Structure 1
Amino acid sequence: DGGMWLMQQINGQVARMKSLGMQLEAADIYNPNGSSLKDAVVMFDGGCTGVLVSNQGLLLTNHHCGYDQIQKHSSVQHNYLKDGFWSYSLAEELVNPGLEVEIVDEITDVTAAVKKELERIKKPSGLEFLSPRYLSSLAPEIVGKKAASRPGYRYEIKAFYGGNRYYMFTKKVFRDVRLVAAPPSSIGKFGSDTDNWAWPRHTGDFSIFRLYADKNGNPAEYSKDNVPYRPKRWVKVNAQGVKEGDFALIMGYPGTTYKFFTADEVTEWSEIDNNIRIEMRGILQDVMLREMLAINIMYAAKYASSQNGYKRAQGANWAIRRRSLREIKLAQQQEVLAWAKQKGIATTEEAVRAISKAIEGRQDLRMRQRYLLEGILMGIEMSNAPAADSDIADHWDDPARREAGLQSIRKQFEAFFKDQLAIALLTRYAERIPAEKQPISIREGIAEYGSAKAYVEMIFDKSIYASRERFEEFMKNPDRDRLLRDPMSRFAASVAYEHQKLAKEVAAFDAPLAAAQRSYVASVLDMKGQPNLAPDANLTLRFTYGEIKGYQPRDVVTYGAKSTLEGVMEKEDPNNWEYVVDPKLKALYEAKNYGRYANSDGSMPVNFCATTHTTGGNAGSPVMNARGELIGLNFDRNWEGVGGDIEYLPNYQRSIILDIRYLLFIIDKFAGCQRLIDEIQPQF
């Protein structure tokens, strides 16, 4: 199994899908000529998925997708992160500036078109035929006035199959997306650390938004007279529950896969990107833990993000050792190599040779890129330190410029908001990177101060952005020269410099590599048929299907397909931030007050898992039953499924899904927001 299918690949798959129990027509799911399910599956925050579930544009996504919004409306008397949030009228729904949600108007093959505007490039770079920025900046010339016209629409074009296809997505872009509801963190990220990437799972990973339109029902900035968008198609919520072996369909926006990796590629990604992440985030997850001195670990967002990718890395390294992945890809790469030879072709073979060549050439440079990335760019927040704009430098003596320049600073600082973390990371960074290959500021700082430690310490001492209260003191009496010579802004600047410098040099290998990549995939595409080959993920809309089914992780151990509230009670621990259970939830358990939302055996459902092929970016994806109705929301994969980006394994890999009845239960029985039960209209 496997495959994240193009929406227009549905005809080639509808067959097998009905086989496993689907009772939908291909055109129910994707319809070029009009209304279909594709119209209900939206992209959230350019990172997650979401689904429209009412005619008033109600939008279901994951708690961890909407975590930042909630944190942004949260405060000491708000604190929606802790208590959750429940709006009872359209007016109560919160506004969140800078949050976008893209629907897909339609999908157009633009392969021929793109390839021509690709030729006739004066001395091309070698990288543009993949770059979405460049590829989307071709859209007007393809569709004319209507592009760069409708303010609501946006035109996205990406490379598929290594660059052997290009498809275009006409995106309606909504810019007033409002926060309806959220559960408390105790439910939304229950087991946040331990249970992450794990099945069994007991997490209510949901949150609710709504799309707002204008009087005529179009994408819109925020306006006090915006109104609930009336969707073409929204998905119906079915609450008659699920049983093992049921058909399950997922539609959403998978971000990245490497299913066409050659053997040498697997090994590099493992030994370079993956391991450097393991090394570096391990240090971070150390120093940031052992500051164990009481506050709640639950709301440490930076830590949580890092740890989430740390664990995925760990589980990827694992699957490469234990699932024998390099050897699996090697077997694939040599099928096509065989097929080529037998058809007397040499294009295939010289690609693999090239791919391996590019790899060994860029070893030092990619390694450098990655230590910089993991160790400093992501790890150390000094890298996002404010920089003085032109006003401050040039026009300090024009009170208007100066105040705007200063207000550029306060703006930057706010987005920038600790000592020993930077030390630990820079210390190890400096050990791995020869001083001459370090960023100017760093190797010079270590020169003066004789240690990465002392250099770091200097910064936190001499800098204005070291703490909020230090900063505000400075702004009481701002000084020009002080702003221009801050050691942390220097750091941030030198680190970014090396970042772009590395990327320039390494282009010498990446470009041969992408070319060779394209050749190789062509061969595969030649061997198999495009209708039967699902491309890598690229944050565009895909579907995947399977069944609700558990697995056997071990000898003697069997995991089932479905999870219940008793699992929550079993894990309870008042002394573990992670497993604190909400009293109102507990009371409900010991009252067994599950209304019509309970399983057949009278247990209260929480999650379930299925054989669908999802990945990062799929968070929030709708999960639908055989008839197209919504039975759940995707939010994770299991530990054994992490190596599915490289190769899908049908008997370990599972998508971890929130039971839609758990969501309902929480709104209804826990929160009391009947209004939203009423808008959603669960079907029984």
Structure 2
Amino acid sequence: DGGMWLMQQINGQVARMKSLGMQLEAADIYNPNGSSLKDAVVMFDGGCTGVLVSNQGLLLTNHHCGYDQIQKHSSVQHNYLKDGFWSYSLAEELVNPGLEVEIVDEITDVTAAVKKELERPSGLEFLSPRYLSSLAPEIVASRPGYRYEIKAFYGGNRYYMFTKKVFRDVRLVAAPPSSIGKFGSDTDNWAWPRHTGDFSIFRLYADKNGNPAEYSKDNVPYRPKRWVKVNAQGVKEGDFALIMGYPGTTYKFFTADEVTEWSEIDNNIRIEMRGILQDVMLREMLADPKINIMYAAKYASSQNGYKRAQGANWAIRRRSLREIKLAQQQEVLAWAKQKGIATTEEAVRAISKAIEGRQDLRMRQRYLLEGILMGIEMSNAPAADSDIARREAGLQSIRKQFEAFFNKDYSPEVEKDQLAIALLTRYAERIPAEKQPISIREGIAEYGSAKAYVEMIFDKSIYASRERFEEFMKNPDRDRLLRDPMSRFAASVAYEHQKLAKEVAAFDAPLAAAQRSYVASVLDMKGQPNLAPDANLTLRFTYGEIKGYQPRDVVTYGAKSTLEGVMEKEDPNNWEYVVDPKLKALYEAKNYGRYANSDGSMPVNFCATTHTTGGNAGSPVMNARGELIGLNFDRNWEGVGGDIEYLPNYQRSIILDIRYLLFIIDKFAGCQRLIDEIQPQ
């Protein structure tokens, strides 16, 4: 069994938790009337998670989480992105502009209070945090240093309030080199086994009172109500593991047809188009370095969502994902019929036609998004400023647009040559001419092919070259700028996207209302304290054991990885698999200190049967005594379909061994200061 439970559901799980070997009370993990692990697990930069392990507000999270800060901080004269960063005193800890970290102080049941002021409307106000948390000050002393959070649970049958302390002075303490921070980021993405040291260190500051404060001299290290002491005594197969964090999004109550839409449209189209994108882009990178130092981030970001989508498809083909949801659908129907309530099948019937009604539109939407809006560069082309139709002020506006479209990281080369032609050609085959943007429709109709159309653009448009643009702004015409082929391509596609959004939003309300009804029946059947809701970026806990899995026949993945695995992957002619000289030296000297396993090997990562997803990156992984033993930073591709249905024998959370973390701080960095603060075991 799995699931992502609310902190209030701690009481119904403790029996099964202690059954796995947990030596903790339920009040240790959550206490509304006391200090607990709740006040030690924080949100980081909105989309990640962190944990305090200090007497002085020290924050542990992922490397790719705090990547933005380290990137800002890093230079040519001090490449922290390459060397890492290590503060040997509090005065060396660097401050970050606009960094927010939030701690939960109280979790409040507020379903009834919201349900009354709901009866008053687009039919989406009962789901949106836009309106829910606006009802917060009416119930609570309502803005000192806090933020009030109200979100929808169980499709809209529950509403909980999160009183939140919000820190704005979080300081970068330390980080490993990228060769350790994102080792294997290109091949080992969404993969197990894994040998990556994905971490980075921050600190929480508060004024003399200990309250959420802005960056100032006043600021003193925050002394937490509660923090998680680090345990470096080791981990073994079968050990109880506890993960707390802020998981982003799941779709636990998808019907048999919502799965199909999620399969045929959401993932398959993404796989199809991104596959073409990456095939071409890769080819052009292994032929001209200049392209590689630039299209790297774009290729990596695309390949990241691509591998997830085909991992999501793997659950459909091999794991019988849809059939499971169909079973669960029939059993709640059979339950409803036996009990004689009809507000269930109507909910299913309504969902079915909602998905049915928007099938053709969303396919057009995804093809436009994945195929053109993301892949094709021309979508950002400078559109005509509206006056052109002192005399008028937009000739100043369009080069401001040009030096944005053509500001930076865009290469007119590759688009022209294959990238746009390949994408548009496939888009043309998939979307009927009657349903594609008017610029593209006319373009292919006038030149016979999507190939010739793109060719016409770059031979007739202004923004096709740098020199051509300012050659043209020598004596600008107010006819050309209207009928410019690339400016029409960007405009028409954008308009088609805007149009597709509105026409499909008519199904947002019937779907959401039918879903709330459907979940309400399921919630009635299984009972709230036995059913975990979907993820909505709030504090959840999940538990399991440190266990590997059986990927296929005759193959078994272990639960723990070692430094040996790194050296087995070392390849100097691959930035992804480059091994840092000192790390290789430590491995040769076996200078692991006593951070090593019981068998002398140096631990790197381990995996557990916990249920994670979305933004649970940087989540603390705690042992049976409540002490920290690792940091979560990923999930295997075989468990991607866990966002729909948890996969017991395949889905695993990929965790950084906390002993490997300390090892880098100690044996690799030499920053003994942080070891003395973060007490291991």
The whole-number CA distance in structure 2 between the counterparts of 1:365 and 1:183 is 46
Checking the alignment, whether the CA contact within 8 Å between 2:239 and 2:545 is kept in structure 1 is: yes
The whole-number CA distance in structure 2 between the counterparts of 1:665 and 1:477 is 64
Q: CA 1:547/1:388 → structure 2, altered by over 3 Å: closer, same or farther? A: farther
Checking the alignment, whether the CA contact within 8 Å between 2:559 and 2:608 is kept in structure 1 is: yes
Q: 1:164 aligned to 148, 153, 157, which one?
A: 157
Q: CA 1:89/1:565 → structure 2, altered by over 3 Å: closer, same or farther? A: same
Shift of 1:425: 2.7
Checking the alignment, whether the CA contact within 8 Å between 2:285 and 2:292 is kept in structure 1 is: no
Q: CA 1:575/1:112 → structure 2, altered by over 3 Å: closer, same or farther? A: same
Q: CA 1:595/1:428 → structure 2, altered by over 3 Å: closer, same or farther? A: same
The whole-number CA distance in structure 1 between the counterparts of 2:117 and 2:660 is 50
Farther-moved stretch of structure 1 (454-463 vs 465-474) = 465-474
Shift of 1:69: 2.5
Deviations 1:128-147 (A, max 9, x none): 2212223233333333xxxx
Deviations 1:158-183 (A, max 9, x none): 11111111112222232333322222
The whole-number CA distance in structure 2 between the counterparts of 1:552 and 1:298 is 39
Deviations 1:352-406 (A, max 9, x none): 11111111111011112212222233334555667899999xxxxxxx9999999
Shift of 1:213: 3.4
Farther-moved stretch of structure 1 (284-293 vs 611-620) = 284-293
Match of 1:568 in 2: 566
The whole-number CA distance in structure 1 between the counterparts of 2:469 and 2:7 is 51
The whole-number CA distance in structure 1 between the counterparts of 2:387 and 2:142 is 33
Checking the alignment, whether the CA contact within 8 Å between 1:298 and 1:577 is kept in structure 2 is: no
Q: 1:140 aligned to 137, 141, 152, which one?
A: 137
Checking the alignment, whether the CA contact within 8 Å between 2:234 and 2:629 is kept in structure 1 is: yes
Checking the alignment, whether the CA contact within 8 Å between 1:136 and 1:155 is kept in structure 2 is: yes
Q: CA 1:618/1:481 → structure 2, altered by over 3 Å: closer, same or farther? A: farther
The whole-number CA distance in structure 2 between the counterparts of 1:402 and 1:678 is 69
Shift of 1:431: 3.2
Farther-moved stretch of structure 1 (572-581 vs 458-467) = 458-467
2:282 match: secondary structure: coil
Shift of 1:238: 0.7
Percent identity of the aligned residues?
A: 100
Q: CA 1:140/1:454 → structure 2, altered by over 3 Å: closer, same or farther? A: farther
1:602 match: secondary structure: coil
1:543 match: secondary structure: strand
Farther-moved stretch of structure 1 (542-551 vs 281-290) = 281-290
Match of 1:221 in 2: 214
Farther-moved stretch of structure 1 (260-269 vs 473-482) = 473-482
The whole-number CA distance in structure 1 between the counterparts of 2:227 and 2:675 is 16
The whole-number CA distance in structure 2 between the counterparts of 1:156 and 1:134 is 11
Shift of 1:252: 0.6
The two structures have a TM-score, normalised by structure 1, of 0.89
Shift of 1:445: 5.4
Question: What does 1:51-90 correspond to in 2, within 5 Å?
Answer: 51-90=51-90
Q: CA 1:332/1:201 → structure 2, altered by over 3 Å: closer, same or farther? A: same
Match of 1:107 in 2: 107
The whole-number CA distance in structure 2 between the counterparts of 1:408 and 1:672 is 53
Shift of 1:106: 1.9
The whole-number CA distance in structure 2 between the counterparts of 1:254 and 1:403 is 50
Farther-moved stretch of structure 1 (627-636 vs 174-183) = 174-183
Q: CA 1:214/1:596 → structure 2, altered by over 3 Å: closer, same or farther? A: same
Question: What does 1:221-620 correspond to in 2, within 5 Å?
Answer: 221-223=214-216, 226-293=219-286, 300-380=296-376, 383=379, 420-443=418-441, 452-453=450-451, 456=454, 494-620=492-618
Deviations 1:244-263 (A, max 9, x none): 11110000111111221111
1:223 match: secondary structure: coil
The whole-number CA distance in structure 1 between the counterparts of 2:587 and 2:271 is 39
Shift of 1:413: 8.3
Q: CA 1:522/1:416 → structure 2, altered by over 3 Å: closer, same or farther? A: farther
Q: CA 1:500/1:52 → structure 2, altered by over 3 Å: closer, same or farther? A: farther
Q: CA 1:596/1:421 → structure 2, altered by over 3 Å: closer, same or farther? A: same
Shift of 1:18: 1.5
Q: CA 1:23/1:138 → structure 2, altered by over 3 Å: closer, same or farther? A: same
Farther-moved stretch of structure 1 (174-183 vs 356-365) = 174-183
Shift of 1:562: 0.8
Farther-moved stretch of structure 1 (371-380 vs 62-71) = 371-380
Shift of 1:339: 0.6
Checking the alignment, whether the CA contact within 8 Å between 1:161 and 1:518 is kept in structure 2 is: yes
Farther-moved stretch of structure 1 (494-503 vs 99-108) = 494-503
Shift of 1:206: 1.1
Checking the alignment, whether the CA contact within 8 Å between 2:286 and 2:292 is kept in structure 1 is: no
Deviations 1:634-680 (A, max 9, x none): 11112321211111121221111000011111111112222222221
Deviations 1:219-240 (A, max 9, x none): 3444465443332222111110
The whole-number CA distance in structure 2 between the counterparts of 1:483 and 1:211 is 52
The whole-number CA distance in structure 2 between the counterparts of 1:448 and 1:263 is 43
Shift of 1:466: 7.3
Checking the alignment, whether the CA contact within 8 Å between 1:610 and 1:654 is kept in structure 2 is: yes
Shift of 1:577: 2.7
The whole-number CA distance in structure 1 between the counterparts of 2:185 and 2:430 is 32
Checking the alignment, whether the CA contact within 8 Å between 1:623 and 1:634 is kept in structure 2 is: yes
Q: CA 1:647/1:440 → structure 2, altered by over 3 Å: closer, same or farther? A: same
Match of 1:50 in 2: 50
1:620 match: secondary structure: coil
2:35 match: secondary structure: coil
The whole-number CA distance in structure 1 between the counterparts of 2:391 and 2:642 is 53
The whole-number CA distance in structure 2 between the counterparts of 1:538 and 1:131 is 11
The whole-number CA distance in structure 2 between the counterparts of 1:556 and 1:276 is 33
1:552 match: secondary structure: coil
Farther-moved stretch of structure 1 (473-482 vs 48-57) = 473-482
Deviations 1:36-66 (A, max 9, x none): 1111111122211111221322211111212
Shift of 1:451: 5.1
The whole-number CA distance in structure 2 between the counterparts of 1:383 and 1:226 is 46
Q: CA 1:586/1:73 → structure 2, altered by over 3 Å: closer, same or farther? A: same
Q: CA 1:436/1:281 → structure 2, altered by over 3 Å: closer, same or farther? A: same
The two structures have a TM-score, normalised by structure 2, of 0.89
The whole-number CA distance in structure 2 between the counterparts of 1:416 and 1:224 is 41
Q: How many aligned positions are there?
A: 669
1:276 match: secondary structure: helix
Farther-moved stretch of structure 1 (157-166 vs 475-484) = 475-484
Shift of 1:338: 0.4
Checking the alignment, whether the CA contact within 8 Å between 1:296 and 1:577 is kept in structure 2 is: no
Q: CA 1:230/1:602 → structure 2, altered by over 3 Å: closer, same or farther? A: same
Q: CA 1:515/1:221 → structure 2, altered by over 3 Å: closer, same or farther? A: same
1:291 match: secondary structure: helix
Farther-moved stretch of structure 1 (487-496 vs 5-14) = 487-496
The whole-number CA distance in structure 1 between the counterparts of 2:274 and 2:510 is 31
Return 5+ residue gaps in structure 2 as ranges.
Answer: 407-415
Structure 1 vs Structure 2 CA RMSD: 3.5
The whole-number CA distance in structure 1 between the counterparts of 2:479 and 2:421 is 27
Question: What does 1:159-198 correspond to in 2, within 5 Å?
Answer: 159-198=152-191
Q: CA 1:606/1:404 → structure 2, altered by over 3 Å: closer, same or farther? A: farther
1:670 match: secondary structure: helix
Farther-moved stretch of structure 1 (134-143 vs 477-486) = 477-486
Q: CA 1:173/1:469 → structure 2, altered by over 3 Å: closer, same or farther? A: farther
Checking the alignment, whether the CA contact within 8 Å between 2:40 and 2:227 is kept in structure 1 is: yes
Farther-moved stretch of structure 1 (215-224 vs 317-326) = 215-224
Q: CA 1:409/1:654 → structure 2, altered by over 3 Å: closer, same or farther? A: farther
Return 5+ residue gaps in structure 1 as ranges.
Answer: 393-399
Shift of 1:277: 1.0
Deviations 1:42-94 (A, max 9, x none): 11222111112213222111112122322333333333322222233334333
